[PDB]
A paper describes a structure:
Here we use the crystallographic structure of Ttg2D at 2.5 Å resolution to reveal that this protein can accommodate four acyl chains. Ttg2DPae adopts a mixed α + β fold with a highly twisted anti-parallel β-sheet formed by five strands and surrounded by eight α-helices. It exhibits a “decanter” shaped structure never described before for any other protein family. The structure presents a highly hydrophobic cavity between the β-sheet and the helices that spans the whole protein and has a volume of 2979 Å3 and a depth of ~25 Å. After the first refinement stage (AutoBuild), without any ligand added, clear density was visible inside the cavity that could correspond to four acyl chains. We therefore modeled inside the cavity two PG(16:0/cy17:0), as mass spectrometry (MS) experiments suggested that this lipid was one of the most abundant among those found to bind Ttg2DPae when expressed in E. coli (see below). The four acyl tails are deeply inserted into the hydrophobic cavity, while the polar head groups are exposed to the solvent and make only few contacts with the protein. This lack of specific recognition of the head group could explain why Ttg2DPae is able to bind different types of phospholipids. Indeed, for the second group (R. solanacearum and E. coli, one diacyl lipid), this helix has a straight conformation, covers the α6 helix and does not participate in the cavity, while in the first group (P. aeruginosa and P. putida, two diacyl lipids), the α8 helix is bent towards and over the α7 helix and greatly enlarges the cavity (with additional residues from β4 and β5 strands).
In Pseudomonas aeruginosa, Ttg2D is the soluble periplasmic phospholipid-binding component of an ABC transport system thought to be involved in maintaining the asymmetry of the outer membrane. Sequence analysis indicates that Ttg2DPae (PA4453) is the soluble periplasmic SBP component of the ABC transporter encoded by the ttg2 operon and a member of the Pfam family MlaC (PF05494). Thus, we present structural and functional evidence of the role of this protein as a general phospholipid transporter capable of carrying either diacyl or tetra-acyl glycerophospholipids. The soluble substrate-binding protein Ttg2DPae, together with the inner membrane complex Ttg2ABCE, transports mislocalised glycerophospholipids between the two cell membranes through the periplasm of P. aeruginosa.
Numbering used by the authors: 23 to 212
């Protein structure tokens, strides 16, 4: 069986080489890029675990499985809509998966990497992995010190309090949280 390090390295190599070979077709049709993303990342992403992680048990247990699913989709689709093109504009950059001692039989692990971009500007990116029945999957992403999972966890709680714990209202507006997540991170970084 593979280790979380290999699952990361393999996914990075597969996705980057796939984008490089088809960079022209994706720039012309983003729906093709979105499909390839779902095909490559889908198997290695714990979408339901991430959704529940952002909602917290306090709110997920007030939601139906059909509702949690609809929250996954708004999350996925909005992430691709506002941050999918980023994988095309700068796929010329370098990535380095840093060492790790995690074994395949482990139940949890964190895999760190570095992204050298624009003349060598390095930001760390970390992936919190969890070993499930379907193998190792991403459960959280930390970027340059910003716990993205906790960021959305806080935004979800703030929006739920404003909507008087209306899940439907929160889901119908979650696209706007994702769209602003980048500046939300920049402000929290300065
Ligand atoms: C169940 C279904 C699963 C499917 C889910 C779909 C998920 C969608 C994926 C969305 C990807 C997010 C990219 C970050 C966007 C960003 O942040 O916006 C530009 C950035 C800002 O930075 P910067 O401050 O320079 O520019 C800002 C100026 O506006 C200031 O003026 O820059 C860049 O382009 C850097 C891009 C480099 C990223 C490439 C790294 C490797 C790729 C991601 C894969 C690896 C995944 C492996 C998974 C493990 C199993
Ligand atoms: C439900 C489905 C989930 C699917 C999960 C799939 C995993 C995909 C993993 C994608 C990793 C991409 C990392 C590149 C970002 C970057 O290289 O950008 C740095 C800059 C900060 O550094 P700067 O301050 O610019 O440094 C400059 C000097 O300071 C000058 O002085 O931009 C930023 O802020 C980055 C932060 C933007 C926030 C958007 C988050 C979207 C992203 C897709 C993930 C989230 C997945 C869900 C998480 C829930 C647990």
């Amino acid at each position: 069986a593979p280790t979380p390090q290999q699952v990361v390295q393999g996914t990075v190599d597969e996705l980057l080489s796939d984008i490089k070979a088809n960079k022209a077709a994706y720039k012309a049709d983003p729906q093709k890029l979105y499909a390839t993303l779902d095909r490559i990342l889908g198997p290695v992403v714990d979408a339901e675990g991430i959704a529940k992680s952002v909602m917290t048990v306090k709110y997920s247990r007030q939601a139906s499985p059909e509702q949690i699913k609809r929250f996954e989709e708004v999350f996925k689709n909005s992430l691709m809509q506002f941050y999918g093109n980023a994988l095309l504009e700068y796929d010329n950059q370098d990535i380095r998966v840093l060492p790790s001692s995690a074994k395949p039989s482990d139940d949890r692990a964190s895999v760190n990497m570095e992204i050298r971009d624009s003349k060598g500007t390095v930001y760390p990116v970390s992936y919190t992995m969890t070993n499930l029945a379907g193998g190792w999957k991403v459960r959280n992403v930390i970027i340059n010190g910003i716990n993205i999972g906790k960021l959305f966890r806080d935004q979800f709680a703030d929006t739920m309090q404003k909507n008087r714990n209306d899940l439907e209202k929160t889901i119908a507006g979650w696209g706007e949280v994702v769209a602003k997540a980048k500046e939300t991170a920049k402000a929290e970084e300065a």
